[PDB]
Structures are given as C-alpha cells and as structure tokens.
Amino acid sequence: DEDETTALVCDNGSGLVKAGFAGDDAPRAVFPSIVGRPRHQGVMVGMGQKDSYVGDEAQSKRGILTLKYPIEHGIITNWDDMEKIWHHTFYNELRVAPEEHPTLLTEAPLNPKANREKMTQIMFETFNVPAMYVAIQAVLSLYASGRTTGIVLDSGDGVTHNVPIYEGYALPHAIMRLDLAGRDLTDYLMKILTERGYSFVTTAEREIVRDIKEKLCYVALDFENEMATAASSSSLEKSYELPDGQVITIGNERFRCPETLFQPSFIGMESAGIHETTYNSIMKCDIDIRKDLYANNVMSGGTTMYPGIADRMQKEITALAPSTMKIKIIAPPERKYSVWIGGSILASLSTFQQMWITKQEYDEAGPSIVHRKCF
Amino acid sequence: DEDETTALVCDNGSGLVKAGFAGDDAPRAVFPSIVGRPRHQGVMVGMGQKDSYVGDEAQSKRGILTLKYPIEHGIITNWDDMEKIWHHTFYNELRVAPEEHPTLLTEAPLNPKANREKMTQIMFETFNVPAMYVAIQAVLSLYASGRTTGIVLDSGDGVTHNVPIYEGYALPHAIMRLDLAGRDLTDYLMKILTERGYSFVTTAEREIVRDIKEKLCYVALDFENEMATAASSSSLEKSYELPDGQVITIGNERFRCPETLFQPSFIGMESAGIHETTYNSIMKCDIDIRKDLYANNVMSGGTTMYPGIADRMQKEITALAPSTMKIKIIAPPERKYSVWIGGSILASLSTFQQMWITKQEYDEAGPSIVHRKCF
Amino acid sequence: DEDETTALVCDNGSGLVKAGFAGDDAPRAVFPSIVGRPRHQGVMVGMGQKDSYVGDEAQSKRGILTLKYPIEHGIITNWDDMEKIWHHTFYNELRVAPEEHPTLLTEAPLNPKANREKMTQIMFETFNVPAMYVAIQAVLSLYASGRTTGIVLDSGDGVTHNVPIYEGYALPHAIMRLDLAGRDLTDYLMKILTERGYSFVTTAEREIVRDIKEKLCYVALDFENEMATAASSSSLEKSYELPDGQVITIGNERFRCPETLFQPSFIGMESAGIHETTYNSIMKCDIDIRKDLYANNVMSGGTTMYPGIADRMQKEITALAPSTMKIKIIAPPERKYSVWIGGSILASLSTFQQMWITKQEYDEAGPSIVHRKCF
Amino acid sequence: DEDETTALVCDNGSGLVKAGFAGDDAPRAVFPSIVGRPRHQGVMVGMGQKDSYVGDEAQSKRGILTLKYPIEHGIITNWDDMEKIWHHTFYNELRVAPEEHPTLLTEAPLNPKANREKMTQIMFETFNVPAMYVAIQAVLSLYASGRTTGIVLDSGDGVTHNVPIYEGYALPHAIMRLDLAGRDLTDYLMKILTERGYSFVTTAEREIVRDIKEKLCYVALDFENEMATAASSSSLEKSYELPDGQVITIGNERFRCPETLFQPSFIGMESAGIHETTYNSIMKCDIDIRKDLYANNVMSGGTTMYPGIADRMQKEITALAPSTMKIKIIAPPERKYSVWIGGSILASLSTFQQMWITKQEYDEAGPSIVHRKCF
Amino acid sequence: DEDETTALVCDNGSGLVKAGFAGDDAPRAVFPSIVGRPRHQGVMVGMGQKDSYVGDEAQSKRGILTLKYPIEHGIITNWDDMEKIWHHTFYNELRVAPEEHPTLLTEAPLNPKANREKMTQIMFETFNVPAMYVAIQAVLSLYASGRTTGIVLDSGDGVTHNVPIYEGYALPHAIMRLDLAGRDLTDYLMKILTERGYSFVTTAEREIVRDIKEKLCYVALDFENEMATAASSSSLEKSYELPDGQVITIGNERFRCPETLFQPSFIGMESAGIHETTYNSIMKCDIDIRKDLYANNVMSGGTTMYPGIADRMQKEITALAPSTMKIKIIAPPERKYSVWIGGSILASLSTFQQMWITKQEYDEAGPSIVHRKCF
Ligand SMILES: Nc1ncnc2c1ncn2[C@@H]1O[C@H](COP(=O)(O)OP(=O)(O)O)[C@@H](O)[C@H]1O
Ligand SMILES: Nc1ncnc2c1ncn2[C@@H]1O[C@H](COP(=O)(O)OP(=O)(O)O)[C@@H](O)[C@H]1O
Ligand SMILES: Nc1ncnc2c1ncn2[C@@H]1O[C@H](COP(=O)(O)OP(=O)(O)O)[C@@H](O)[C@H]1O
Ligand SMILES: Nc1ncnc2c1ncn2[C@@H]1O[C@H](COP(=O)(O)OP(=O)(O)O)[C@@H](O)[C@H]1O
Ligand SMILES: Nc1ncnc2c1ncn2[C@@H]1O[C@H](COP(=O)(O)OP(=O)(O)O)[C@@H](O)[C@H]1O
C-alpha cells in the first residue's frame, strides 16, 4: 500500500473471475464464479449446516449444491446474489478492503446501460471505492501484447468481441456483439454425447462435461475432410476418463464441436461465423486503412486457447479477403489474460490517474455520470 | 396384402408395444412388453416346463416369473432378448412374416446412435424388411390430431418429449429429452406407500402397484392447497382394492404423486419441471414465431391421460408466459395413440413411398446409411 | 412285463405300505408295516417256532408279538430291520424281483438327507433297481385329482404336508413339516380314555385302540358348542365294541380328539394349527398369485378321511382370509391314495423316462448324486 | 442429574434393546426384547404364579413361556404389549422415571408413518417425556466412527439399511429398505438343519438355534468353491454343543447360511443382494460425487459382526464397480453399537438442544408435528 | 380347633391310609386299609359276633377274616364298602366329625373321572365337608422336600407316578401312569417262592409274605452279575423267620424281585422300565429346559424305600442320558411321607384358602364342578 495505494484489478469476465493488485504479471487469484444453494436437507447439524459459495470449495462440492452463473452473455441478471462473489474475492484471495485499494472493474461492451450504472452503485456505495473505472474488455487486450494497433477477438464463456482499433483511436462501426460463448458451446457438447449414449443435465453435471472439450478438441483446418476421415478410422478418437463413474470416448465429435464457433449453422443460428465475422468488422472501417488491421489481428480470451484456433482462422480469413494482403492472427500463448493483465497495465501506468473516479464526485452527480466519460 | 402390400406399423414405445397394418384406426394388438424367466424350479415336467414371455400370458403369471423391461428411457440395453418381443408380435397378433408387409419402426429422439443402426440390422437382416423407416416419436403425433403446427408432449413409461414443430418445419434448438417417465413415477409411489404401511418390491409386485395410480390420482390445480385440505379430511381418500391379499387406501398421496412430473423436486432432481419445461423449448425458437406454438400445444402419450393433466398444465403455462397470449393444451381423449395412429397415417399416405428403405440399398451401403436420411 | 417292464410303485408312507405296478387304479396290495418280535417263549417247537413279521399275519397276532413302527415322522430310524418290509412286499404281494421291474420310492420332504441316500443304497445295491426315483409325497397328489394347480395337505400317521404348487412350478418358501400325525393323535386318545376308565398301553394294545377313532369321530364345525352340547346329552355318544373283552363307549371325547390336529393346544404344543397352518403357507407366496391356490386347496392322505374334515377346515380358512375370496377344500372320496395313485401316473406316463435313475450311473457317481437331481 | 438432566438414550432396534444415559461409552444395559406368556398351567400357586417378561428372566426360562417379538422388520405390530419393555427398561436397568431424564427414541427409516406418531404418544403422553427426538438408525452410525462422510449398512434382526450420506447432507434417492434380517436368516438355518436331521420349531426353540450361527459361520470369499471344498472334507465342520439334549455338528451349511444375505436366491427372493445392493444406492447419487462414498463405506449393526463380513463384501463391490476406484468397508470391531453410541453422542453434544421436543408444544400441536421436523 | 378350624389331611393312597390335622410333621395315625368279612361261622355268640374291619384289629386277625383292598391301582372299584375306612379314620384315629375340620382328599392322577366326582359326593354329601380339595399325588411331594423344581416318582402299592414339574408350572406331556405297584410286586414274590418250596395264597397269607421283601431285598447295581454271584455263594442269602409255622430263607430271589419294577420283562410286560421310564417323561419336555429336571429328580413313596433304590436308579439314568449332565435322585430318608406331609403344608399354608371348596357352591353346581378347577 505504502503512502499511496496500488491499483487493484478485477476481471469479472462472465464465469471466470480474475483479481489482484496494480499491474502484476498473471492475476493474484483465479477461480470460477458460481453461488448456488444445496439441493436438499442433510441430517447432520452445525458441522455442514453452512452454505457452499463462490466456487472453490463450492466448486469442489458440485454434487450436493447446484451452481448458477450470476451473469449471462456478459449481462448480470442476478445482480444482488452476484455481489457476494466480489465479497468473497475482496476478503480471502485479496484480503483487502474495497475502500482502501482502488480497483478496476471490467464490463463487456454493448450491454444494457443499467449493468454499468448499477454495478457502480454496488461497488461505489456498498464498497465506497477509493478510485475505480468501468473497463472495456477488448481495449485492454491491446495494451498487453499486439502493440497498439489491430483487431482483437476475446470469445468467452458468455460474450465474444471483435472490435477494430487503430493507433490510439478505435472505430465503433462494427463492434460485433456475437451471441456466442464457450459455455453455450458446452451445451452443444452435452447434446451430442447422446450419440455416444452418455447423458448429462445439471449444474454440476455440466461442470464435469465442461473442460472435457478443453482437454479434447481439434479445430480442423479442412473440416469437411475431418468428418469423412475421422469417421473412417479411430485416429483422433483417443480417450478420456470421467470421474469414477465411467470412461468416456470422444469420437469424431471431438473436432465438430469447435465449428459452431466458426459457423453456428450446427447450433442453428446463421447470424454469425468467425471467419465471416472478423471480416465484416474490418470492412466497415476506412477502405484506405485496413492493412494495419489485417496483419494486427490478435486473439485473446477463452475458446481462443482451443487447440488450433489460429490455424483454421488463418486460412479462412485469407480466402474471402483479397490476395496480396498480409494477414496474421498474432495469437499469444499467454492470451486469455489480456483482460486482467492488459487492464492492470492501464491501471498502474500513472499519468492516467485523472480518468479514475471516486467518492464525492459520484455523490454530487447522478449514476449517469459514472456511465458517462466512459468509452 | 393384394398386389402391393399394406403398411405394417409397430410402436415399440418403451414398455407398451403397439402393432398393426397400414393406417388403421386404433392399433391391431396392444400388450405390455416384458420377457423375463421363472424365479425357481417346479416339480412338474412337460406340462409347465415352457417359458413365459412377451407379457400377455407371461404378464398374467406375474408371481412365478420376474418381468424385465428390455428398454429403459427409450434406450435398448437388452437388445438381443428384446427381439423376441417383435418375434412374438409378428407371429400371433399380426401373424404376418416380417419380409412381406413393410413396417414402420418407432425410435425415441436424441438417443444413442447405436440403437437406431443396430435395430435396423436386427429387423433388416434377421427379418429382411420389404420396406422400413425408423420413425420419430414426436412428429407422428402432429400428423394425427393438432393439425400440422404446434408443440407436442408425449411423456411415457421411459421417455418424454417436448419438440416444437412449425408448419412443415421443426426447429432442433430445444427438443428436451427429460429423464422422466410414468414407470419411474411408479417407483415413487412404491416408496410413499410405506406411509400407509404397505411394502412392494419385485417385478410382478411393481406391476400390481403400477396402474393403481392410473385408477387413483389427481393433478391438483393448486397443489399446495391440496395437501393442506386433503390432510384435513377424507374427501379425496376414497378406496381401492388389492388383489385378494388386502384392501389398500390411497390417502392424500393420491394427488402428490403426479407433481414430480411437474417438479422433480420431490423425486430429488431439479433439472426439469413440466410447466417450466414446455416454456423453455418454445422460448428457444424464433421470438417472432411462438404464437402459433402457444395455442397449438398438444399432449399425447402416457401420463398425459393422467386425470386433470390439461388443468394444471393450463394455468401454469399462462403464469410464466406473458399476458395477452392465447395458450391451449389441445389434449385429445384419443391421445396416447398418436405414436401408432399418427405413424400409420404417414406410412400408408402414399406419395411418401420414396423415404422408406429396403433390402439391396442397405446391403450395398453401411449401417450408417439407414441412420442417415433420418430426421 | 413284455419287452419293456412296467413301472412298479411303492408308497412306503410311514406306517401304511402301498405297492404295485405301473399306473393302475388303486394299489396292488395294502398292509400296515410293522416288524417286531414275540414277547416271550412258547413250549411248542417247530410248529410256531418262526417269527411273525410285516403286519398281515403278524398284524393279526398282535398279543403275542410287540409291533414296532420302523419309521417315525417320515424318518427311518430302524433302517436295516425295515428293509424286510420291502423284502416281504416284493415277494408275495407283488411277487416280482426288485431288479426286473422299475419301482418308484416315496420319501417325505424336508427330512434328513441321509434317509434318501441310504434308502437308495439299500434298494439300489441290495436290490440292483432297473430304474428308480425317490418321489416327493405332496407333488404326486396334484398329478391325480385337483388338476395341476393348488395346495395339498396329506397329514399321515407320522408326517403331514402343506406345500403350495402353482402350475408346473412350486414355491419352497413354506413347505411346512408340521410335527403331527394320526399315530401320535392316537396316543392322545389313549390318554383320554382314562376319563372313561379304560387303560391301554402296548404295541398291540395301541393297534386296537387305533381305528376306534376312524370308526368314531366328529370334527365339529363350532367345537366350543360341541363340548357344551355333547356333555349336556348322550346324542353323539352312541357306542362301539372292543374285541371280546368289553364294550367301550366313546363319550364326548369322540369329537375333541380331532381338534389337536387343528390346534395342538390340547396336546401341548402351540407351534401349528391346521386352519392357522394352511394359511401361513399361502401367505408366503407371491401376493398377486394366491387366488389360484385358495380355490385349489385339496386334502389327500390320512386323517383327511376323518369324518367332516372339509367342514371345519372350510369355515375357518374363510374367517382369517379376506372376504370376496373363493376358497375350496376339493376333498375327494378317493383321497388318501394320491401318494400311490398319483405317483403311478407319473411313473408310467412315458416321456418322463429320463428322470428315472439306474445301475451304472449311480456306481460311477457318489450316493450324493441320487439325492441330487431330485426336487 | 444435577441442575440439568443428562440425555437418556434408548435403542429399541427390533429385537435387542439398548438403554442408558447421555453420551456414554457402551450402553448402560442390554437385553433381548420379548414379552410372551407361559404355555400352560402349573399346579403350584403364589410361588411361580407371576408372569415372565422382558427377556432376562423370561429369556432364561424359554421352555415354559413362548416368546414373541413385539416388532417385525422395524415395524411395531404389537404396540400396546411392547410398551412394557420400555416400562421394564426405565425401571430396573435405568431405574429412572421417564418424565425426568430426556430420552432419545430410535426409529427405522421408511416405515409406516403411524409407528412414529403413535410411539410419540405412548412415550410423550404415558411417560410425559421432558425432552425427546425420534432418531434415524443410519445417521447415528456416522456420528460415531467413519467420520462424517460415507455409506452405512446396519443389517439387523428385522431391518437393514444402506443410506448414502455426504458431508452434513444425505441424499434420499436410494435409502434401500431391504426385507432382510438376522432373525429371518435364523429361520433359514432352522430349515437346513433337517439336512442333519435336527428339528426345531417354537419361540424358545428358535432362541437356542439362534446364536448358533453367531458361534459358527463363514462368509466365504469364493462361495462356489466352499461348497465343493467343504463337502470334500471335514475341515470347516468342527463342532458345537446343544444344551444337554444332544451335540449338533454344523456341516458345510455353516458357510451357506450367510449368503442369503448376499443373495436371497436361496431364500427365494431375488429383490436384493448385498454386493448388488450397496452398489445401486451409490449409483443413484451425483455421478461426480461417489468417490467419497466408495472409500467411506462403513458396516455397523447386526449380522455385520458375522465372521468375515468385510472380506466377501470387499472383493465383490470391487468387481461390479469400475477400476481405479478405492473402496473400503471401514468395519469397526465396536460396530453394532453405532445406533446407541452414535446416538448418545448426538443427544449430549449440546448446541443441539433446540431439535429435541417436549410437553406443551406437542399438546398444542397435532401428533403430526412430532413426526414433522424429523429427517 | 379355636375360632377357625385346622386343616385335616387324609392320604388315602391305595392300601396305606394316612390321616391328621393341619400341616403337622408325620401323620397323626397310620394303618393299612382293608375291610373284608370272616371266612366262616364260629359257635360262640355275642363275644366275637362282631365284624373285623379297617385293618388294625382286623389286620391283626388275618387268619379268620379275608382282607380285601377297596382300591386297585389308585382306582376305587369297591366304593361304598370303602367309605367305612374313612368312617373309622374320622372316628378313632382323628376322633373328629367330618363337618367341622376341613380335610384334604388325595387322588391319583390320570384315573377315571368318576372316582373324583363320586368321592366328592360321598365326603361332601355324607360328611358335609366344611372345606375340601381333591389333591394330586405327585405335586404334594414337591412342596415338602426337593424345593419347587424337579421330577418326582412315587411308586406305591397300586399306582406309580413320574410327573415333570418346573418352577410353579408342570408340563402334562408325560405324566406316566405305569401299571406297577409294590402290591403286585408282592405277587411275583409269592410265585417265586415255589422255587424254595413255599406256598402262599390268600388275603392274610399274602399279608404275611408282604413285608418280607421290605425286610429282605437288594436292588443290585449290576443285576446280571448278582445272579451269577449270589447263585455261586450263600453271601446275601442270610435268613428270615415266618411266624411260628416255619423259618423261610430268601435265597438269591432276594435281589431279583426289585428288578421287575425296573424292567417288567420278568413279570411279563415290556410296557415300561424305571430307568427307561423316568427318561421318557423328561424327554417329552422343552429340550432347552431339562437340566433343572435331571438334577432335581426326587423319589418319594412306597418301594422308593426299598434298599438301594437310588443306587441302581442313579447309574442307569446316567447311561442312556447324554454325558456332562448332572443327574441326582435327591432321595430323602423321610420320603414316602411326601403325599401326606407335603399335602399338609399346602393345606395349612393360608393364602391358599380360596382353592378349597365347600357346601353351597357344590349344591348349586353339578358334581362336575368339584372335578373342575382341579389340576
Ligand atoms: N484452454 C482452454 N481450452 C478450451 N477452452 C477454454 C480454455 N480456457 C478457457 N476456455 C473456455 O473459455 C471460456 C471462458 O473464457 P474467458 O473469456 O477466458 O473468461 P472470462 O470471460 O470469465 O474472462 C469457458 O467456456 C472455458 O471453458
Ligand atoms: N390412462 C392412464 N392413466 C395414468 N397413466 C397411464 C395411462 N395410460 C398410460 N399410462 C402410463 O403411461 C406410461 C406408458 O406410456 P406411453 O407413452 O403411452 O407408452 P409407450 O411409451 O410404450 O408408447 C406408463 O407408465 C403407464 O402406466
Ligand atoms: N378313514 C380314516 N379315518 C380316520 N383316520 C384314518 C382313515 N384312514 C387312515 N387314517 C389314519 O391316517 C394315518 C395314516 O395315513 P396315510 O397318510 O394315509 O398313510 P401313509 O402315511 O402310510 O401313506 C393313520 O393314523 C390312520 O389311522
Ligand atoms: N456377533 C454376531 N454374530 C452373528 N450375528 C450377530 C452378532 N451380533 C448380533 N448378531 C445378529 O444381529 C441381529 C440383531 O442386530 P442389531 O442390529 O445389532 O440389533 P438391533 O436391530 O435390535 O439394534 C440378530 O439376528 C443377531 O443374532
Ligand atoms: N420300607 C419299605 N421297603 C419296601 N417296601 C415298602 C416300604 N415301605 C412301603 N413299602 C411298600 O410300598 C407300598 C405302599 O406304598 P405307598 O405309596 O407309600 O403307600 P400309599 O400308596 O397307600 O400312599 C407297599 O407295597 C409297601 O409294601
């Protein structure tokens, strides 16, 4: 802390929560965010008569308690129950009071106005923040790696982004709030397993099936060929183990799951497509300036990690876009941390002290002000 | 038969088997499907030294022989032993060879892939089907009553469906394979009887307790009030008789049994709820097109018959769904026969001859093909 | 005999012996089985210096020689001395060698294992049986009258049975080896006579008092009333004559003697009761299947003949068992012959030739084998 | 007693009664529970003209008086006559009035509702309990040994349990009220002795044959091999002595008796099987959480003591359950006392004072309330 | 007498009569019971012209008057003539009127019903008994010596008993009315004397020969050896004197006479045997309870006194009965008085006043009532 407090940073992405102090490599503490209640009554009293919350222990005990995601698609529907997640985050992982160290809140772009004003009140009023700013998901990634120019994609468990940013300026013509996420992607996985005869349907049950994809999955550069080849032989079949109960085998569904990200045709919505999506945003920008963006494409966030993301993405973007154009995915191994890390850099980079807002100003001004001055 | 054979239809639901010829009102022969063996040895020889199978006679003699359901949750685990059920159905009830008259097989949606390919081989190879198609449970109901547009629910002894179908098209976003059934519902009944001091636990024993619910049961429009009122007085108590052994009385447990269908909270799983379930499927459809579905809701199948199913279902759907919306259950007195009857209409409706598959094509193509072209 | 020998059948019940050839109405020769020695020495030599055995002549000469029952409660304690009974039976009544014509042995169920294995050796080794099978008392009755389904009671001079048999199968949950018999019943008679001032105590003496009951006795539908009414007047008193010595009169003890069969309370053991006993066996059967047994109750054997057995048995079974249930005693006038006759039917009913066992197989296998394959 | 009374605990299992004060090692007084009347009249008057009850002295004098078990399968059919057992227990063994020291009642789970409400009235009204709670058999075991997590089996003389409990919570999906017990197991023993030629049939007679098994019996890890080996030689035969009358020898039936517990196939019911039974309960639990239960299996109660219970149980559970899974029986030498001891811990563990119920509350509320708040 | 009369007790065994007042050591007056008439006419008149009766004087004058035993085997055949015996007993030995002091009648168990009802009338009507009870021979012995538990044998001049009694209760399964007595035993003596050339045959003649056995006799532990040894030498021969007429010598027949009691093989009836008899009664009792009876065997009555009764009885009971069992004869030197003395104790032991019956009750009720309430 010293004479002047460090900059506390909190990710609050959608399902995964990242927290910590001023610009520091890797977040101080990471844990999934859930806060449900136990399914039914237990005979014992006073030994286990206490609620399981905020992942971690609650996360470990999946079977007894149903887990609920407080926020969907980067939108907080739960609100009040969610606040405890921050409550747990501040005391424990950080073990610091909200009023002392300034914290950077992170909010997904193009979401209801209410979420940002109300979020401020919860943190600002209940926690009397010493200094705070509602951050934008896509911008922070740029601060980290990828220099200061390019297009960033941060598909997550609830929300995905594709915002074009040139130099110190970013054009708002094609932000692209696609209704896709690793979470719902997981659901598709649950439905397809029926193919293998496995059935999963519950909050904890979903948790177990979730990650299976992380461990097992291929983007497949030529997709079409993959189904015809994988179906032909075991090759990519391999195996995985399901906790105690059984041993599951991820047939050729192992590579088809990732495609919905690329073309929701399988899921059922033709609204967007990753190779088709990244392209539209870049087109709705100055025709003269796109070269800097084509070669500055950087993928950071969830699903980005997915095995071979850059590979399929790379070939497709080239197909639709004109030749003689240099296109790169600049996908870093440290990706997925852009939101917290990049944000941390901005927070404790001094000379940027004025942008942060605190007590007094907000009290004299309407909740609209906190939302104002943000972009 | 004539110059060209009629269309033989076979339900093969899960526990109840329906069979017959081309689109004919009501199925030709109905009987429960079981095929277990006698519990122990009998001294007599040659007079009773023959196995009791395929319900009917086997069904009548419940005490001496344990009955097993060859398929659970619309999933065939037994496979080979089950085939005799069809064997008995073909010779006796229909008394027609499998090679001559074309038959429509019925299969529950979102089940293991293996069931459909393997089922084909058994019927296709062992019976050399002249023509056949693996049907879908939910679709056939629409063909019968309810016009050509709406949402159908066919809760059965093993599997339940809630698939939204608009016009000649159906959206696959929320089929809903709930893990509920009249059968397991029966088990709950067996456990609650302990309340009255009655104990039942065996295949035949379950059979007797099974149907008791059919004879005695109320959905209860306001449930909460029912326990408080029914417990207060005898009113709904009435009575029932148990074969020779005693006379049982279905206390206030008479109306509580049906609720688990509505809210498995009592059974112990919070995954689904009828009023909550039907709603989710409709929501996961085009926001603009839902009105046709709200007013075209039709319930056909087991448990649907349950006294007052439409009543409780009706009021609850209206509560969660927005006002000014017209919702109906279009529950027909002939329901439960949609699978066979509706199917029969499709089978012998001509101009649909090409969809049916037969010998030669399958032999030249992999078992995958029979599974293919189906949806 | 012809090219292939007929089926010789031997009852060997407990005190009464029945023998004969293949399924023939009524047994070839009947006589009580005893084989004791003369009480003391006679002066004459060579004219009467020969032992009196195997009833008949020995039976006629009761005073000079004490008679012993080789088997008690269907259990052979004497063993070796008993074999002569068969010896006499084979040569004389049947006048056929044991090695030629195949014979069916009869054994009481739930008795020591030794009796059946040892019995085989005596007949199998000493007599080299051409073919034989150790039969079960209760089963044979079913073959005769009573169809193929029901419960049979064969109370005898040593052993009684109550085995429930459904169709070609019989459940072993409640065979019921009650420790009751007409013989010991006789003893009760001897003790009660003291009431009338008559004293009997010896093997021959017991023989005379035995049968008296057969000639004089009433089951009494309302028992309680009988003692109060019979004591009031002579009515049922009537009379009987005792060979030469005196003329006895069977007071009201005439109807009380049969009750001990129904309730050994008088004899002194509360273990079983006929009305209470038949009921327990049926209850320990499938709850669903009991109706066939209630209406198929058939009494065959000793004491069954007793005057009015069906009458008292009839009303009582109805009292404890639930109403609306049809119960019958199906007591045939030819009863008591079920063991031999029914058995004879099974023996010479062909197509049942494989079950019979003979020389060679037993020699190569242990005595346990003869016991095995039996049930 | 002091200023505040200690916690009196009463087992009331089914045949064996345990009683005592607040959480104390081993129960204060143990004795079997029976309360029958003498078989017949004795000439002497005023010296022995007094009834023999509540085991102990009554138990010692088995021949003269028939003993009846007031409760079967954890179900009280006798009710009123049974109350004296508690009457004897309170005065004598404890020698304390029911109104002063609070007592914990023990009731078998999944039994008629009436037993728990009526039991309360008898103790609550007739004894005006200062404080009481109707306990659950399975839960208490957990409190003692086995930590706070696992699956417990407490097979007894009338009722058996297999309830899965995780942490301070227990799932009710598979409690498993198997219709098995040490008592009925004894009956099987009585029927098989006929093999050795020994006959037993009466309340006292049963008592003598009962315990014989305790003294002589083997679970047999490979069963099949045991019959083939034991029959081959005397080895396991050994010997036992029957009071005065004779000396019995427990042939190879010594190890077969325990199997019916494992597979009632011998008894005649295929409803359950120990290795098959423990498995089903664990399966009907969260798929993710079962590891804690597999390694936390603890057997406490009757028949559990049976020689080698853990051995056979151990290998079989491992066979059907998937590999790589750690399974233990955590069978303690002090087992069988879990019901009383574990219960005593809960009773006198303070901070659990509110759960106990007393006078006033029950009087103002219906008997349903005492049943309510229990689980 | 005082304000309330003492309890008069009358043995009336069979040949010997015992009489007296309330529980007093040793009977007040003892004398054999006979009442015959003089053989022929005497010339003298008025000096000896009076009948000789009721033993004593009549007994002294054996030659002139033939003596008749009014009762045989504990059965009164004479009836009317016998009453004078009581007539003489009441006036003379007791010198008290029958109406004043209450008296206890003694009756042998398992005798004709008539003897007990008719006996009541004679005493009750002719004597108007102030209070009376028909006692049982065997029970009274227990009251005296031998505690309250055991088996008693009271072989007498006409009747013998072997009734097992446990605690205040006695089981009726094997009372054992053996047809043996010291009297008939005497006859055997008369016949064997022919061996020595002595002839005796008349009522008085029998009296003289009777007692000779009392004075001279050995039970002989090894019997067989005794004939072989005694015949070898004079040893046991010794001598006796016959009144005036001659001096007889009891050769080796001295020890053989007692054996018939043990085995009537010599007399001619194989019905019973002392060592074999005591054993059967104990066996026909609860198998579990026999130990108390084996060690509580007590012999009281006639022939019991016989020299060495306990010796032979002791070794033999041990031979047939299983080892490790403690058996005793608890034969008291005061035995033979159990019937009167033991009875007297019961009579004047107060609190047992209700059992006694008197005038009024019997008059209003049938003679059957006096017989009723007795056991
Ligand atoms: N290495 C990985 N492989 C596959 N999927 C991943 C991987 N890492 C994260 N994910 C998925 O990314 C989603 C969350 O992404 P992310 O954007 O990083 O979190 P947040 O939005 O909370 O900041 C989840 O559905 C998760 O399963
Ligand atoms: N009229 C009825 N009332 C209550 N339950 C019924 C009724 N008819 C059928 N059921 C229940 O419905 C289930 C089988 O339903 P169904 O779907 O019609 O058969 P299937 O799946 O074999 O085609 C059973 O559990 C049965 O008990
Ligand atoms: N007609 C009858 N009336 C009374 N008792 C009879 C009659 N017939 C046979 N009994 C009795 O039945 C007993 C023998 O019965 P049974 O079973 O027929 O013979 P077994 O066991 O030798 O085959 C005897 O005690 C006999 O006295
Ligand atoms: N050590 C033992 N060996 C074999 N059986 C035993 C042993 N201990 C108890 N049993 C049996 O367990 C049964 C009673 O068990 P338990 O559950 O402990 O009593 P309760 O149900 O009354 O609490 C009886 O059938 C008894 O014979
Ligand atoms: N001391 C004795 N020695 C041998 N025999 C005796 C003795 N005392 C009595 N007896 C015989 O016992 C018989 C009468 O026995 P008891 O039972 O005592 O008399 P009661 O039946 O009249 O009561 C007579 O035959 C008598 O001779």
Ligand SMILES: [Mg+2]
């Ligand atoms: Mg993110």
Ligand SMILES: [Mg+2]
């Ligand atoms: Mg169906």
Ligand SMILES: [Mg+2]
């Ligand atoms: Mg018979």
Ligand SMILES: [Mg+2]
């Ligand atoms: Mg217990």
Ligand SMILES: [Mg+2]
């Ligand atoms: Mg006497």
